[model samples]
Target: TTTKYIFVPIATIGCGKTTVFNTLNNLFPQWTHIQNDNISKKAKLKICDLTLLALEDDDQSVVLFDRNNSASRERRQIFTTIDQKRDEHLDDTVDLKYIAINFIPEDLSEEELWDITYNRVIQLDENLVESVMKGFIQRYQPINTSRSPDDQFDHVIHLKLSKDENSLKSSLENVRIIIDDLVQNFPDLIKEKPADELINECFQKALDYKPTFVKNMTANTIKKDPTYYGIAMHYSSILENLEIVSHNEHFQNIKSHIQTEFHVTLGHIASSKQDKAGRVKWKKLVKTLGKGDPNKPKSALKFFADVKLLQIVINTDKLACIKVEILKIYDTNDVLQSEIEPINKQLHITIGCIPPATAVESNITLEELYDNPDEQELKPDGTYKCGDDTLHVFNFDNPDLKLFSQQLFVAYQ
Candidate 1:
């Protein structure tokens, strides 16, 4: 009777989850560590899907499903999805067990958790804003064994958040505790525990692990597409400003055409189907902009641009967009010049477009508008008829736009 175990961490951000996972993985090379952070946001595969795939492997006796299973809803989702999908990927006769690693202890107050996590995260990523971390702390739902979803766990291992700044000591002790628990409870799985010195050495090596697949600030950027580098827009701010445009009666028909995600394109390589030259340019761009010391934390690129809406341009049955004038762009480092320049001739955000008419068509539409400015005259009803298209000019006030990019684009394919 072979029993496979899945260690699910019910933790918030910066609870040293990754470090612990890495340590365990180093010690037990047979175990698989599946990280949610590494998964593409657009990927069809869910965490549970990946977990089931890992569990199907005969060599892997244990799988670490690494994610912030903070909220009760998330816990319920994990259990239900895995349970529902398991039979599709594995045999029903296989004895599988779920173990919850409760990272945030019950004794720790919300304030204390914040203090511990905030310090750890800030140390890893300085550019990560406080609000992002505060959200995780505020939303965390503690593990209650009596609860339905949580009650499904075969066992629960409680781990403490270290108050001391020297977390290596605490992390090592935590690893030892986990090992002791496994050896005592699940002798079949542990068989024989590694020596203390070996554990310490392996844990130390794991601490130095660096991830290759770094996500963009937005976390929605697809890596499989032609490589593109750009400044991710503040999504909520843009939506707030676009609310008026969305509610307008004239734009009702094309409500679904508006882009939910926004970004100012700096440079992009054309798909291999289009041009090979762009690929060469992309290689050069990566070399120049992506250069950084491996030892140091990669700081995010930050910039501010003054922009004002210029017009609401529509290219009948093609695409619609709000053209904006980028008054001035500057880096936060007081470096008067920016290393990267906008490749597009015009600056605009794609409002929406009809099917088969993608957002890229906005650039072509803008170019046409620029070439024949006189023909786009405003009509009496606050609309300009350009052939079958409609356009509206605006003199909106300037808005300061803050943008950031944490990683250079890579071609995943």
Candidate 2:
């Protein structure tokens, strides 16, 4: 139920894009700042990847992707990704909120706008002023959704600054505009401060400015062990076998889960106490099925007594998939030994089932069956839609997953 916001800075060069970002950083220091320009030299997508990884992990409070984003297409790609993440979690309480703050100057004329940024550029570095101006002039594109259909932005503000030193431009009128817009539209993101007070606060903070460093870590990198390829190939074959038995009804019912909820074992369950409720629901479902006798295991499922606690679910792929995550391996001596990682390839197994009356049906492709817009739900893209029920995905590393896969395959095949 976490409410998170992502802010993207959109502007041409010398337009105080970073100034707005810096102000936000100062006001809300807890947010994760992905300085796209400062992070990589190869490609911008790498920065996007790092941002995605940070976003997926429960490590940060809020994520801020800061860059010129002068081109609308570049912004669209990142926005599209955020949209997809929201779709994947449609039923969840998590909401992905985002906005782009475009910086503008009071002067509408191109030449006067150049003159405005020119002064600021000249003061900073005289030698590079013309080059900077030339770059901005040659390829700069404003965030004008009216001009081009592709540049559409859902929530944006044109923060206009001016060059005149004696007017309200010097009085920081833009701060008032920004504050008012936030209070009206995005009150959740702001503290609702008075423009004059925030302006003075920004000024005092500027006087005591200190440099900060943001570090990005490539923590999940894994090296291939000698045994990685052999096991991975074996896992791949097992996935093919799973696909062969996917249509089996027994396996299908076994794969079935409640429409709104899914199950996972203790280890795979994230280390959060709030997850206990979901675990309890799954435990009750399991408990009702089997009689007290282990040898005469009741219902349709039987689990090894020693590994009963390991019963869990994994996020499965299109085919059964083997996910060879590097776990801390201990030797039989009960002491920590040489630690190794999965190979770069790791393991992959190509990797469904159906259900009872209470649960919604799975594999109901929207594009095919449901054409009646009333009876059928539609995806955001206006494509045909169907039931929300799906088999909870599972992967390797859980012995429970291994047992279920083995048992289901043996009986159904």
Candidate 3:
């Protein structure tokens, strides 16, 4: 073979990696060339693996790993639960190179770095990145600048950046060298790698995205013959740090931050109470699938996606509202029973919905109801229910469930 292993430049955004790749591709045209950026962006996932798959699929023996360096948010896998993904990736199709791009822009200032980072919203959504930026950037480790060419790549080229001479002259020289190399080597492949395609390909190869747990769990439900336990594991992830969030000064602080920074109104009470307790109780119920517990009901293993819990909590809470009573969510087969209906959903409050609306409709606002009609409806004799009687909602607020859940989560968080 004319070419053996060609380790390519892994890049970072605004790093001028394109000029390098275009030069090299022209120089090395005869050899099978693979670009990593296209499919990763088009598919918006599994970038490195996909690029390698393309290279490996074409009977191509080697690859040019043109991707942004691993210090990027996606490369670092921030907000992604990798322990969970390692299991899924076991089924992946190809071996991949993990090249980190550490290119420094000309006259790169610390402020400029923040400016590049701030303006780079494509890196991830503005809000999520904004929230996790400090933790994410603080943990970033740069690529090994000190590595020998053999250590850095099968072939590594170094450069100095200058505006008049370094950038312009060097870029031209690099282009000529690539042209000469192309005349000798890459006559056939030049047309295949148009400039636009090179950039498009790099974008794909460098993409790293966080998985949505809801969608992932939904997919698992489709792929596997899911039992209740598998589904429970999926939902359990969200409740990992469950505690009486209301009592949590830290929780209150975060809630305050969200309100002030994001302009969202938070409440002294939260609907998460029922959701917290109900989920924990359901978690225990799901756990019983493994072993015998005298207290645990060996209900025939019912299986569904995460929405079932959402449904159960909403339905049960609504029924409890009609009765204006609180019971353990899984306390009765009547409410928690498989395939049961809450004929009377208009009574108790359930945290399963928007808490403010559910809260105003029920006992949580009883003390405030005297002053606020917006809180709840008055009865005929100087008393009013929420007047919230509507087709979409059946007045239900479960204070006991909320309090019970608060106690339960206080221990768990």
Candidate 4:
């Protein structure tokens, strides 16, 4: 049973993280599905070390972890601070062993994905399921179990969303393929450092440093769609040919890997592997008018609030929210439909005045917003809460001060 690897699903939004779990639940009948939602309110920040929490006296069973590495960017931010101590604070608490899920280019819009998720939430509205979606978006860190020991998993499958984007899903899967192929070619070295920690880090470094059409392809970017993989193979050909002379355990292992598999020195790798990218252009698929409720807005933020709209639960917890995203967060503040574009991710925040609070605690930790909490004005006057995020309202036809339009606004504490 421990002879294979497992592919856990962790998406930012509507990359079908829940759908994969649902499908797998039907596929594997024998394994007891240990839904992670049952234990932690915030599966992303606190997965509670699975190694320490295995069921008592239970036989070898497959656990479907619907956990989040939520507010993961923030978590990593904390790690940067903790990592300063090197071992005492950072290494002591951080453990990497969970599996991850990512999507492809064809499914990039948050609005489209969120629609699926909102519909699912509205449809299921089950207690356990609702609890699953709680305070964890932007909180969970992605887990790539591809580098773990064979015995760690019974089976590992690369669930790719598409070939277009630079998503961590594609980047990570590419690494998985590289690992599987490398190991398949070499039998003994098969037992090399197979820990998800080592591999995910290496793969992520490629994602971080590697160039992509979308610059926001952070590690959590793995949870989004059309998952651009330009990062995974970043100058891959260069590394394949370049011999690593460093004393670092992680560096050497990856160096040895490229040599054995592609039979190319780590030196020539940069020149050999050309960067590949994934793209989903909606403007190209222009229809004078879309089908269904003409009154139905296509924006992820708008659709989630429309009572007439539907939702789809891609997983027990993670949803497919097609929400609005500024193509470039720092550069543009444009809200007009003409200048706006949609991006996908599992949302922690819901639309309108209501938030679908669940059993999950917020993956968000206490941190200073922007540069300085004291200097920054998060919200106006005295209308905002401590943990709420600032939302934007588009000026598109509605004119009801209280009900018609609202966006999250915050101020420095």
Candidate 5:
């Protein structure tokens, strides 16, 4: 099978996005390169129209589209136009995949960041710099799995500019090889990799950074009143880390333990928080099926698991900080019995920041929980609240329950 790459590189004008593209283009001069500005001025057809025409070719296996692609809407249009053309020319003769690389810089002051861009823009148009900067401010949207009705890219990579000269040129080095392999064997793309594995691997390589943790210990052991301990999942980066640990034998053993002991199942997550948003925002309440403290009236076993520990600082100044999900179970005599709601979530293993307290409690201070606690609404269970006015409920009936089960199991390592 022959596969063609629709490589899209994006960033603000003068952000060096095109430099990365140019470097790759130099490596694979055989690949078709389309610059939106040049094409718009010289080609009789519109940009989208030109992309559609170019993609319809039977001979080409790679194509690079260079443009500001600053807005999510603009990228969406290009993707839609090309996809519409696909339906008209369906065949094993040519399969196309959209791959995107986002180029962004870090640690630059306002002047340092835009100096090269402003000078270049001014040379092109004296008044263009202000409008270009404004466009970047108001129109640029980061690409992730969300945005359009569908994600245009089959694979996505986020690239960061480097301070060192060698690293900057070296970032896309592996990517060029992947491009060659795909061009040589297009059918391999349909192998249905471990779900976004190629792009994920590429992303990890390009944005590699050492994992760091900042710590804090609790002053009180009150949290361990009576409960089983597990790691807490927070930040989209943890989800990214999940793929790294999913294949470890120890991780698998922990998952096997949950399945055997709890009789719970596990499955893959087709869409994660990152897929829905550029980043992750905790929205789903994942719970285990076991009852907690049968001695307590409302007490039912509740379980949570994680794979890697996140940076946890307990008793921060006056508040406790960590990624935690807690459901306070109570006995009939407990005063908060009226507030109790039945929760059914199964426990699985994961590696994450373990709370200092052997168990977490409501009094435990998580300032994040109080972001606007009063404004938060009640859960469907009619008994709980989130400071953000949002409660993420992972119901048993959900077809994706198995995925949650796996999330718990993966955390075990």
Candidate 6:
């Protein structure tokens, strides 16, 4: 049986890890390179998941798990996750081996290592600040093969690094060293060594290669688990009004259920985990919003909606909300935006909710309250006592609710 080998790199940033992976991938077609940097942060399939999936292919014998597994904790996590997931993903008959590729040498001082790595990184992207490189250097834990997680590796290939030699030359050398080591150790896996000239050519081509997948830096700034596209409101006047309403005797028991943030949700924007069609709708909406000025870059997409407060609703102990009627919608350039369809049937601002009750309960509450209004009575205070809660009818009109949002937003599901 041909034993499948998984290469795990124990290195820091700018350590020629990508170059070596690229070169090896070009040399061996069966060797799949799974780059951690290339994979989206929002991806469902993690490094181990992708690694197991790649190994499931009968034709593929090797998988280069490309990432800076510099910390011992990071290394331990890799081994633990793969071992835990292996049985479920791979066939019982398949023989698997772990190989650790150590990039930094033992003798290299931290200062020298920083100088070499920092220079290489700056050459690639000048925008990457020194603090970012320093952060990696501070956290780097050297590989100790005798240790628990590091000891798990069947074979460890130690690659050379030097201040005297540039990354290009060192990377090419690393490619050769890795190739020779693999062939010598795993004869059955890498049956024959390719020509030195062919290796050099492949390495050169890989050096010139530019990666298509770049990590979205802006993704880090956004709210987590945001699953909807909406017109978020931070209007002080509106918020003050909502605050006053929350103090009403009807909401005395469910005072904690008041919503801190308010918004008029346009549609659900799907995450990588769920509601896939919502993601498609989100992209289409972004495209439609950009149609006005295709040539110019948009800092923020401005939207204007003519909204009227239909009624103040209370779903007993569940939630409090304001049913809103979106009279008119306008785009960034003051163009009447009507093509895009809203996912929500009844647009409402979630005022608040009880512990077990959430913002989504507002949607259901509005539907139920409107459908069955026979028992509702108009009180002396001009408030309608509908079932267990008070409902206030409002003629409040906001002609232009100036809403500005980024092209994409995380939906609060």
Task: Pick the TM-score winner.
Answer: 6
Task: Encode model 2's per-residue lDDT on 1-413: one tens digit a residue.
Answer: 65565666666555655555565555666667777646656665565566655566444545667666766666777767655655443436565566667675424667766777667544412444466455655665666666442345556766775686666552145445666777788666665664566666764464244422212212233431111011112233344334433564334544443122122111111112335654453344333222222332122233211111111122222111223223332333433323222222222222222322321111122122333556532122112222442223222233443322211000110
lDDT of model 6, residue 277: 60
What's the lDDT for all of these models? 0.68, 0.43, 0.33, 0.30, 0.42, 0.70
- Badly placed stretches (over 4 Å) of model 3 are 1-6, 19-45, 57-62, 70-152, 160-320, 323-413
* Candidates sorted by TM-score, best first: 6, 1, 2, 5, 3, 4
Residue 124 Cα positional deviation in candidate 6, in Å, after optimal superposition: 11
lDDT of 6 by residue, 1-413 (tens): 65788899888777889888999899887789999987878799988899999988788778999988878888899888988999997788877899999999988899989888777765433444466667667888999988788888889999988754535588888888888897898887678989999999999898888743225321233323334556555556456555545556767756765566677776654332345565666666656644333233222346656555555666666677777666666765767777665666567888778778788777766555555556433212245555565455443334343334323222433
TM accuracy, model 4: 0.25
Candidate 4 wrong stretches, greater than 4 Å: 1-6, 13-19, 40-61, 71-98, 103-107, 124-413
Please provide, for model 4 over 18-62, each residue's C-alpha lDDT reduced to its tens digit, 9 standing for 90 to 100.
434443343334333444444445454333244223322234233
Lowest summed lDDT across 10 adjacent residues in model 1 is found at: 404-413
Instruction: List ranges where model 1 is wrong by over 4 Å.
Output: 124-127, 166-168, 211-413
The better-scoring model by lDDT among 4 and 6 is 6
Candidate 6 least-lDDT 10 residues: 217-226
Winning candidate number (lDDT): 6
- Candidate 6 lDDT: 0.70
Q: Which stretches of candidate 6 lie over 4 Å from their true place?
A: 89-94, 124-132, 164-168, 212-383, 390-413
- Lowest lDDT 10-residue stretch of candidate 5: 211-220
TM-score of each: 0.55, 0.43, 0.31, 0.25, 0.37, 0.59
- By lDDT: ranked, best first: 6, 1, 2, 5, 3, 4
Q: Once model 4 is optimally superposed onto the true structure by TM-score, how far is the C-alpha of residue 374 displaced, in angstroms? A: 60
Give per-residue CA lDDT, model 3, range 1-413, as digits (tens).
22223344433333344545554544455333344434333464554454334354344534455544435344334113332443343335433332232344334554555455445433313344444433434444444445422143322344322333234433444444443443454444343433645534433343333222112112222221112221122223223212333343323322322211100011112222356654444444434323222233222233221121111111112211111322322322223433212221222222323332432343333332234546444222222343342212222122222222211010010
The per-residue C-alpha lDDT of model 3 at residue 16 equals: 42
